[PDB]
Amino acid sequence: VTTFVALYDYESRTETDLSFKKGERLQIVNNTEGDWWLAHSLSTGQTGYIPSNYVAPSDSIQAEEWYFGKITRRESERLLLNAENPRGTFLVRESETTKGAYCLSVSDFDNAKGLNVKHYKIRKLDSGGFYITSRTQFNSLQQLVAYYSKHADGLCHRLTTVCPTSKPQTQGLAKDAWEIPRESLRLEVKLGQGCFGEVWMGTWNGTTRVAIKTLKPGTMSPEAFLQEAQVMKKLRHEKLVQLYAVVSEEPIYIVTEYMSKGSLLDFLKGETGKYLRLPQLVDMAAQIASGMAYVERMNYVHRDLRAANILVGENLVCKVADFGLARLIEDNEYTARQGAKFPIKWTAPEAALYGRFTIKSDVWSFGILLTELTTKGRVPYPGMVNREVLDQVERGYRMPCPPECPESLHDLMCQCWRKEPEERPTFEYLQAFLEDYFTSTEPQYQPGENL
Ligand SMILES: C=CC(=O)N(C1CC1)[C@@H](C(=O)NC1CCCC1)c1cc(F)cc(F)c1
């Protein structure tokens, strides 16, 4: 057995789990898998279950504050470019492209490019040591990071601030927490009204901040929902709002990861919103596409993808919410894809006409969402009304490229609107197309040739 070190405070919720503060020494049995592990605190003496993502071995590279694991290139830039981060804010991560190399990412400022991240490959020596340039080597990553925190010696900037992060969200409210009773949940601020319920900020067991969706009675069966949520429960992805739990007594409450800065449509309208440029819009659309790509890999269907059901967080993280919920609603109008409650303008016509909701109808929607993203939230088909959008779409019509949308993107929307589902692109493609939309020249990594 290995002592692990805590990387974040975790305020004990239930009986059976453990409170600990960042730094505590915890004892666990090596070969454990799963999301919740059994720990004995050699610090506190207390014992319980802990979320496995909140610890790392003692004295291993992972243990360090600045070590961000196998986070992605595109997402490290998200965290580093936070505008409160001084120059020299850094992190260390695993390289996505060179088998076992690590990579040091560092914020800098440049007259041409503004504030930008510079990525340095760190290769491991025959000695187990580490080097950014052959000229300057160490026996460990920690020595390396120490040294460049004192002089840039080649680096764009001396390392100053460990990259600031947030506590990850655990995977579940605690071990064995799926269905919970109303009284564990406290509704504090109500956040908005839907067509079939409300959305709330709240707290579970007086500790964890949660979102709480409350369903209007008669909307779905609590039976149908629960059997559905055995599926949703399994969809874990960093761009899907995580489904924590549920109260299966009418009225259904659905407990979800709190998203701090609200719906995407809201956020696009209104300030912090009126001034985003395309490369951040396109980075948002790529985040949604990575969420939907996982949905795609899991043979699932969202059924109401659009900006109103994307939530936004810190640093413009975007996440897909309320997936596969819309199927279970019983409102004989809505289910007919009729009425004031049905997003006809985002609905692929085969869904509108034949209930044929599939991952490809979700690709249609995604194309509409791209117009929402390039208009800062303007309604789609602006001159039309809903009652008329079906005929017009079945008769061949499509949206002209919004003013101020690069035609390369608009032609992507047009693949999303191709008449025959099976010739619309996949989400894998939509994801790769957008994480690579802007092509610079060679400086992928800084050449450590000699610095
Ligand atoms: C009528 C417009 C609307 O807001 N919808 C309707 C589907 C269009 C909301 C909705 O009512 N949400 C309420 C239930 C819990 C919180 C508030 C909705 C969005 C989805 F992504 C999936 C759903 F199943 C439902």
Swiss-Prot record:
Its EC number is 2.7.10.2. Residues 185-438 form the Protein kinase domain. Residues 1-60 form the SH3 domain. The active site is at D304. Expressed ubiquitously. Expressed in the skin (at protein level). Platelets, neurons and osteoclasts express 5-fold to 200-fold higher levels than most other tissues. Changing Y334F: Loss of kinase activity. Loss of interaction with PDLIM4. GO terms for cellular component: actin filament; caveola; cell junction; cell-cell junction; cytoplasm; cytosol; extracellular exosome; focal adhesion. Residues 66-163 form the SH2 domain. ATP binds at L191, G192, Q193, G194, C195, F196, G197, E198, V199, K213. Dephosphorylated at Tyr-445 by PTPRJ. Phosphorylated on Tyr-445 by c-Src kinase (CSK). The phosphorylated form is termed pp60c-src. Dephosphorylated by PTPRJ at Tyr-334. Normally maintained in an inactive conformation with the SH2 domain engaged with Tyr-445, the SH3 domain engaged with the SH2-kinase linker, and Tyr-334 dephosphorylated. Dephosphorylation of Tyr-445 as a result of protein tyrosine phosphatase (PTP) action disrupts the intramolecular interaction between the SH2 domain and Tyr-445, Tyr-334 can then become autophosphorylated, resulting in SRC activation. S-nitrosylation is important for activation of its kinase activity. Transmembrane segments: none annotated. The modification Phosphotyrosine is found at Y102, Y334, Y445. It catalyses: L-tyrosyl-[protein] + ATP = O-phospho-L-tyrosyl-[protein] + ADP + H(+). Changing K213M: Kinase inactive. Abolishes ubiquitination promoted by CBLC. It is a lipid-anchor. Phosphorylation by CSK at Tyr-445 inhibits kinase activity. Inhibitory phosphorylation at Tyr-445 is enhanced by heme. Further phosphorylation by CDK1 partially reactivates CSK-inactivated SRC and facilitates complete reactivation by protein tyrosine phosphatase PTPRC. Integrin engagement stimulates kinase activity. Phosphorylation by PTK2/FAK1 enhances kinase activity. Butein and pseudosubstrate-based peptide inhibitors like CIYKYYF act as inhibitors. Phosphorylation at Tyr-334 increases kinase activity. GO terms for molecular function: ATP binding; ATPase binding; BMP receptor binding; cadherin binding; connexin binding; enzyme binding; ephrin receptor binding; heme binding. Its main location: membrane. Changing P222E: Kinase active. Interacts with PDLIM4. Belongs to the protein kinase superfamily. Tyr protein kinase family. SRC subfamily. Part of a complex comprised of PTPRA, BCAR1, BCAR3 (via SH2 domain) and SRC; the formation of the complex is dependent on integrin mediated-tyrosine phosphorylation of PTPRA. Interacts with DDEF1/ASAP1; via the SH3 domain. Interacts with CCPG1. Identified in a complex containing FGFR4, NCAM1, CDH2, PLCG1, FRS2, SRC, SHC1, GAP43 and CTTN. Interacts with ERBB2, STAT1 and PNN. Interacts with DDR1, DDR2 and DAB2. Interacts with CDCP1, TGFB1I1 and TOM1L2. Interacts with the cytoplasmic domain of MUC1, phosphorylates it and increases binding of MUC1 with beta-catenin. It is linked to SRC kinase activity has been shown to be increased in several tumor tissues and tumor cell lines such as colon carcinoma cells. The SH2 and SH3 domains are important for the intramolecular and intermolecular interactions that regulate catalytic activity, localization, and substrate recruitment. May be involved in blister formation in Pemphigus vulgaris, phosphorylated-SRC is abundant at blister sites but not in normally adherent tissue, which corresponds with loss and disruption of CDH1 in cells adjacent to blisters. Phosphorylated SRC is increasingly abundant at pre-lesional sites of blister formation and occurs prior to changes in abundance of CDH1 and DSG3. This is Proto-oncogene tyrosine-protein kinase Src. The chain holds residues 86 to 536 of 536 of the full protein.
